[PDB]
C-alpha cells in the first residue's frame, strides 16, 4: 500500500552521463555506443542566442572543439554531426556501461522519469509527464541541458527526452532523442508562450483507481455518466477529452476495482463541480495527473 | 526553476541490492562488503509473525538456509548472526559494487530516497521523510522488504532506513542499518497503531521559501511573528513546534529571499489560518513537508 510519484531507477541512465562543453559552454551529453548525444546550443554563446544560425555557428567548429568528459577522463571526438536540434558527437570509444536502449517520441499525457545533471554528473531523478501543451514541469537550473527523460521496460531504456531550455514561464522545453522539438518551441530566446496546460483526464481516472486500490474512497459515489456528458464537464474545467481509447486504457484498473470507467467518471465529474471540500486523496488536496493507467498497475503490481 | 519531489540517483544504491530466500520466504538484502542485511524476519513463515521468537526461529537455520542471489548468481553464505531486527549474512565474496558507505540513524523530519526493491530488483525510486510519529509513508508492496532508504553526499551512500513492515493503515515501519526499529514498532502481526502525523513546520517553511524562490509568492503578506505566537497557531494544526535551531537552520534560505523567516512563519500562520482559498503553491493544493531546507538549498543549488 501507499502510493508514490515513482520514477525509474536512474542507474542505467547515470552510467550514460557526460560533461560536454563547447568553448565556453558547459552542458551535459548523453553516451550511448559511440556516439554522445547533446543539444545543438552548446555551440553558442549568449549573444548568439537570440537568433542563432546552427549551421554557420556549427562550420566554426571542430572535432577538437568539443570537449567530452566521462567523470575524470576526456573521450576524443572523431566526428560531429547536427540532427535536427542535438549535436552527435561520434567518439572513439563505445561506452562500456551502454544499456539496451531504444529512441522514443512520447505523446502528450506519457510520464518519464528525468534524470537531472549539471557537468555530467546527476544529481537527482524525478518523475514528470509531457503535457498537453508539449511543456514539461521539470526542475532544472543553468546546466541542466542534455539531461534526460525515459522509461524503462525491464532492461531496456527507452529515451523519449532531452532539456533544451526553460520558458519566462519557469516550464520546460526540449527535444525527442533525434532532436525534434515537443511542440512548436524553438531553441532561441524568443517570445514562446505556452498554450494551454490542460489536466490528463486519463491519468486522474487512473490515480482515482490507485486510491481505491490503496483504501482512499470518501470519493466513491452513487452515480454514473456518459462520455458525452462527462466531456462537457472536462470542457468546462479545462480537462482533456475522455475517449473511448482512454476508457479501454482504464479496463484492467476498472477490473481491479470492480469500478466500471463511466463510474469513476461521475466520481471525478463530482470532485470537479463540488471541490474535495478539505479533504484529501493519496495525500494530495488536487486531482493528480502524471500517473498514467501503466504506471498505476506497474506501482500497484511491483514490476521491476 | 521549478521544484519537483527529487530522489537522489539510485545507481549506487541499485549495485548492492540482493534477493534472500529463506525457507519460503523472499524479499531484498543489501550487500555491502562481505555482508548482505537483510530484515530478521526472512526466517518467519506466516504462522510465526504472531509471536514470533527470533532467536528460537534463528537457531533452526544454518548458513546453506539462506539464499544469496545477486542477478542471477549465487552467492555462499559464510557466516550468519542476528543485530536487533536484522540479519547479517557474511558472504565469501566482497560486492564490487560497494560504494563509499555509513549507516546513519535519522530523526523525524528528515529526508531520504527509497529505491524499492522486489527479488533483488529495482522497481523504483522515491523521495520521503521519518514522520514525526517514526512511520514513513512509502510505497511498498509484499516482497519490498530489505528495500532501503538512503541520502548521497557526493560519493558516500548514507543509508538510514530499512523497510520491514506495513501497519493496518498503510502506513510504513523499519529500521536503521543496526536493525533498531524507527519508532516503537516491533517485527510482529500485534496491535501498532501509530502515533499523531504531525506536520514537519521548519520543511513547510523551507518549501515556502522554495516557492518564492521559484516564483510562487502570492501568500507573503504584510505580517511579522514571534516563535511563541506562531506556536501557539502551530500548535492548534497539529505542526511541529518550531525552535530556534529550526530559526537557524532557515538562515540561508531567508538570507537568499530576503524573507525572515519570522515573517514566513506569519505567512504560514495566515495560510493555517484562511487556508488556500483555491490557490496552489509549487502545484501543490497543501503545505508540502517532505523537503528540508538542506533539500530546498540542495535542488535550487544543483549539488552533484
Ligand atoms: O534555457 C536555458 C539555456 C537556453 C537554451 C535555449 Cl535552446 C534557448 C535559450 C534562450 C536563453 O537561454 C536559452 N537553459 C536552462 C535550462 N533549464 C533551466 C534553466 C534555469 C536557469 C537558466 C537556464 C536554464
Ligand atoms: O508487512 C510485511 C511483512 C511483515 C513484516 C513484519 Cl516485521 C511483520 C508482519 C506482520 C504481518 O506481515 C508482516 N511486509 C510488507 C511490507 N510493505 C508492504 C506490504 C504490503 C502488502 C503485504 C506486505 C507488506
Known amino acids: 500500500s ?52 546552427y549551421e554557420d555557428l556549427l562550420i566554426r567548429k ?92 525491464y532492461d531496456c531504456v527507452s529515451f523519449c527526452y532531452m532539456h533544451h531550455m526553460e520558458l519566462p514561464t519557469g516550464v520546460h522545453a526540449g527535444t525527442d532523442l ?21 489536466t490528463i483526464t486519463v491519468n486522474v481516472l487512473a490515480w482515482l483507481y490507485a486510491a481505491v486500490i490503496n483504501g482512499d474512497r470518501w470519493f466513491l459515489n452513487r452515480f454514473t455518466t456518459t462520455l458525452n456528458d462527462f466531456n462537457l464537464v472536462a470542457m468546462k474545467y479545462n480537462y482533456e477529452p475522455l475517449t473511448q481509447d482512454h476508457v479501454d486504457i482504464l479496463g484492467p484498473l476498472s477490473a481491479q476495482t470492480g469500478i466500471a470507467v463511466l463510474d469513476m467518471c461521475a466520481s471525478l465529474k463530482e470532485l470537479l463541480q463540488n471541490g474535495m471540500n478539505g479533504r484529501t486523496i493519496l495525500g494530495s488536496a488536487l486531482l493528480e495527473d502524471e500517473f498514467t493507467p501503466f504506471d498505476v498497475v506497474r506501482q500497484c503490481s511491483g514490476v521491476t
Open 2 to 53: 501507499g502510493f508514490r510519484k515513482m520514477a525509474f531507477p536512474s542507474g542505467k541512465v547515470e552510467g550514460c552521463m557526460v560533461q560536454v562543453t563547447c568553448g565556453t559552454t558547459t552542458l551535459n551529453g548523453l553516451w550511448l555506443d559511440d556516439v554522445v548525444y547533446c543539444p545543438r546550443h552548446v555551440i553558442c554563446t549568449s549573444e548568439d542566442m537570440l537568433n542563432p544560425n
Open 62 to 153: 571542430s572535432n577538437h572543439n568539443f570537449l567530452v568528459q566521462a567523470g575524470n577522463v576526456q573521450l576524443r571526438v572523431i566526428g560531429h554531426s547536427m540532427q535536427n536540434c542535438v549535436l552527435k558527437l561520434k567518439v572513439d570509444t563505445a561506452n562500456p556501461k551502454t544499456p539496451k536502449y531504444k529512441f522514443v517520441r512520447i505523446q502528450p499525457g506519457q510520464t518519464f522519469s528525468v534524470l537531472a545533471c549539471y557537468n555530467g554528473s546527476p544529481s537527482g531523478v524525478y518523475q514528470c509527464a509531457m503535457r498537453p501543451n508539449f511543456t514539461i514541469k521539470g526542475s532544472f537550473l543553468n546546466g541542466s541541458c542534455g539531461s534526460v527523460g525515459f522509461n524503462i521496460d
Open 178 to 198: 533525434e532532436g525534434n522539438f515537443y511542440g512548436p518551441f524553438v531553441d532561441r530566446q524568443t517570445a514562446q508562450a505556452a498554450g494551454t496546460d490542460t
